[PDB]
Design a protein around this ligand. Sequence first.
Ligand SMILES: *[C@@H]1O[C@H](CO)[C@@H](O)[C@H](O)[C@H]1NC(C)=O
Lengths: 49, 40, 44
Amino acid sequence: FERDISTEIYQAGNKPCNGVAGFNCYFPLRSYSFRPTYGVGHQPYRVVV
Amino acid sequence: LPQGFSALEPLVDLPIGINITRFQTLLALHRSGWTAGAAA
Amino acid sequence: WFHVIKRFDNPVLPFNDGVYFASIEKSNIIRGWIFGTTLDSKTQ
Ligand SMILES: *[C@@H]1O[C@H](CO)[C@@H](O)[C@H](O)[C@H]1NC(C)=O
């Protein structure tokens, strides 16, 4: 039950990213991009616990 | 700190859920620099 | 042990599995507390 909303740039390698994208510097968040043409496994689902 | 025994009754429970690593106290300064009381 | 009287010592103390806080005081100098990780606006 831990929520993390930090937008700091992930440091994949050892070179510092300094908040900008670069070599071994990827944004921690990706987009699902839900589409009807996608497969059943890739289809969006709403989960309530 | 005096001798003796005393038990602390529960006071509050909050579902805040955030990660905690550091803390700092808060003082009530009075302007009558500044003049403040003595506390420990 | 910290004393306030000038004596103005409000450092950022570390947090751990728990904290025991004691205050010998009169006239309510100590008011409240702040908790967090980076103590800035970036984190909760
Ligand atoms: C809580 O925050 C501190 C300071 O940013 C960090 O070092 C620690 O890893 C965090 N806790 C978790 C479980 O990530």
